[PDB]
Amino acid sequence: FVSDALLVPDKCKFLHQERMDMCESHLHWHTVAKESCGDRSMNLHDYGMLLPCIDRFRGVEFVCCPME
Amino acid sequence: GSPPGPPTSIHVEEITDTTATLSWRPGPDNHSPITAYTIQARTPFSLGWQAVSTVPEVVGGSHLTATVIELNPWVEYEFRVLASNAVGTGEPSKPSKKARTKDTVPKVTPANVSGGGGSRSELVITWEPVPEELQNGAGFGYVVAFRPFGSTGWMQAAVPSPEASKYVFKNETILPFSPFQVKVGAYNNKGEGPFGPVITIYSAEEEPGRAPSRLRAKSLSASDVEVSWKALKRVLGYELRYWEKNEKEDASSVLRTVGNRTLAIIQGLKGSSTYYITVRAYNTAGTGPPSPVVNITT
């Protein structure tokens, strides 16, 4: 497994999260990213999975960018 | 009238990222009032037992508790206390139970960030992994940033292994032997540390496009032969590939030269035998197409 390289334009932020105890689905890790950009007043423009543990992962990486 | 005895029942009242509050029970004063206490500690990264700084700076004989300061976050410690009277310093106490300090964000960057090499369409980024005593927490990983030199934004990726020392990015947009700006950071469960300074690493180059030509050979002895060819993306040397008449090219031996030497000598051959020899250029991206084969006898 190799983590995806995400594109981070100017004033965007690269974020990531993981927990060696968890083993969650892709859809769960998406909602983690979409909400984290949301309560920062930013949109989700790019994301990928971290640490595979069947279609389940221990982490996520994503990019938030300002709105409008 | 001799030095005092050792304290007993060393206990850790609390522990933080850098401090540890300790308590202990006094031993015999050996007819001389204990004037002060002193504290030592030991980690897997210390040269055995070492003295520590405390608050207060001087732990008096009436003090059965003190705070050790200036510890290393996320490090497993054990402590001991020594009594000291007017006659002299006493025997150390027994070690406390092991206690790991609390964690924090990493304060260091990966050392010796560098890279280069690989096959075409690849960008190789390397770094010296952070040793355990500087990681400052569980879940230690790395963040790698890179971009073509002069670009606006960055490409970034989380590399979660604490022992990760290499990240390889492959893409059809990677131009051969092109410069990239690269910086590598660190992180653990408590947050992210700082990035290192921006360095320039070049992408992988392309293997040689052409074969050497005019391959000729002549024997020097029953086991030694001299091989020469003609010169031609850059080249760092040439690779010989040889096998005897009753063998195949794929199950052969290899020999590599460095530079533009254009000549080479093969040892270890058998006398009165026929061999086949192939010369092939190479750089860091691999080899190019081979030259037409030559046959020589010993």
Author numbering:
A (entry chain B): 124 to 176, 178 to 192
B (entry chain A): 598 to 829, 836 to 901
Q: Which sentences did the original study use to describe this structure?
A:
Human APP appears more closely related to APPb than APPa, so we crystallized the E1 domain of APPb and the FN1–FN3 region of zebrafish CNTN4. Surprisingly, subsequent structural analysis indicated that a proteolytic event had likely released the growth factor–like domain of APPb so that only its copper-binding domain bound to CNTN4 (2.93 Å, Rwork/Rfree = 0.241/0.281). Overall, the CNTN4–APPb and CNTN4–APLP2 interfaces display many of the same features found in the cocrystals of chicken CNTN4 and APP. As is the case in previous CNTN–APP complex structures, the bulk of the interactions includes main chain–main chain hydrogen bonds between two β-strands: W751–Q753 in CNTN4 and L129–P132 in APPb or L134–P137 in APLP2. As is the case in the CNTN3–APP and CNTN4–APP interfaces, the carbonyl oxygen atom of S126 in APPb (S131 in APLP2) forms a hydrogen bond with the hydroxyl group of Y764. Furthermore, CNTN4 residues Y784 and E789 form hydrogen bonds with E141 and H139, respectively, in APPb, and with E146 and H144, respectively, in APLP2. These contacts are absent in the chicken CNTN4–APP and mouse CNTN5–APP complexes. Overall, the sum of this crystallographic work indicates that the CNTN4–APLP2 interface in zebrafish is essentially identical to the CNTN4–APPb interface in zebrafish and the CNTN4–APP interface in chicken.
